[PDB]
Amino acid sequence: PTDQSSYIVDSVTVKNGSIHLYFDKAGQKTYERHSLSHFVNLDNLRANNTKGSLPINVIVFDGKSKCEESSAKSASVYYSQLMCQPILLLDQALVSDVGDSAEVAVKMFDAYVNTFSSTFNVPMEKLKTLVATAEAELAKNVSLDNVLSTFISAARQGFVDSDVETKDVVECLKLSHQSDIEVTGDSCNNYMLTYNKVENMTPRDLGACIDCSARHINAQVAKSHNIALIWNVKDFMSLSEQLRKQIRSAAKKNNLPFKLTCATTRQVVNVVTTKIALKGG
C-alpha cells in the first residue's frame, strides 16, 4: 500500500500553537502537525482557492455537502503531484471552535517564548513580567508583530548579542514555529546540498544565492563530517518558497541538521565546498 494521494482526517487535537490531524494509513493511526495560524481563515485551504496553491498539504471542505468532498478528493490528485506528498482532507466541522485571532495569537506567542528561552538559554522567571504584559496586550488586540518585537527588545538584554538585530530574532521565531525549524545564535554557513542545482534556479534564486555567498556541499562530504546547514534568516528568506523547501527536504533526506540563525557572522570554511556561481563562470 503506497502513499495514495489523499487521506481523510478523522479527528483533531490542539496544543502549544500547533494542531494534529489524525488519519488512518494502512490500518495504523497517524498524524501530521501544522501551525494553528493556517486554521484562522480556512478559505486558503479550499480546493477552488484563488491562486492555485496550498500553504500546507491540507484541503478544507464541507462534510455536509457530497460535492465538496468529492471535488476536494479529485483536487488532491493534482495537489499531491504538485506538492510531492499526499493531501489531508479535513471537514471544516472538525476545526469549528479552534481559536479567534487573538486566541490563536496568544497560543503562537507562548510558543515563540519557549523557542526564545531555549535558543538564548534565558530562564523563564526573568521573562515572567514581560510575558504578562505581552499576553494582556494581545487580549487588547495589539498586533502579534508589535507584541513580539516589544517583548524581544525588552527580553534580549544580556542573552542576545548586540550585533544581531531584533527584527532577525522576530523572523527566526515566527518561521521556527511555522515549519518546525531549529533556531541558533551561531555563525551561519549558508551551505546548500549539491542536489539543488544552479541549472534549475530562477534568476531571483541564483542571484539571491550569489548575494548571500551561498556555497554548495556534497551530500556525502556533509554526512561523514556531520555538517549542519545553518542559514541566516534574512538570506534564507531572500530565496523562493520552492528553493527554501528543497534545501530543507534535501538536508532531511541526508539526516543533516537544518537551522536558522539571527547571526550575520560566517563560520570558517574547513570543508571542501564550492561557491555557487553562474553556469558559465
Numbering used by the authors: 1665 to 1945
Paper lines:
The multi-domain nonstructural protein 3 (nsp3) is the largest protein encoded by the known coronavirus genome and serves as a central component of the viral replication and transcription machinery. Nsp3 can be divided into three parts, including a large N-terminal cytosolic region (~ 157 kDa in SARS-CoV-2 with ten distinct domains) followed by a transmembrane region (~ 20 kDa with three domains) and a C-terminal cytosolic region (~ 41 kDa with two domains). On the other hand, little is known about structures of the transmembrane and C-terminal regions of nsp3 or their exact function in the viral replication cycle. This part of nsp3 consists of two transmembrane domains (TM1 and TM2) separated by a luminal ectodomain (3Ecto) and two Y domains (referred to as Y1 and CoV-Y) in the C terminus. Previous studies demonstrated that the highly-conserved C-terminal region of nsp3 is essential for subcellular membrane rearrangement, yet the underlying mechanisms remain elusive.
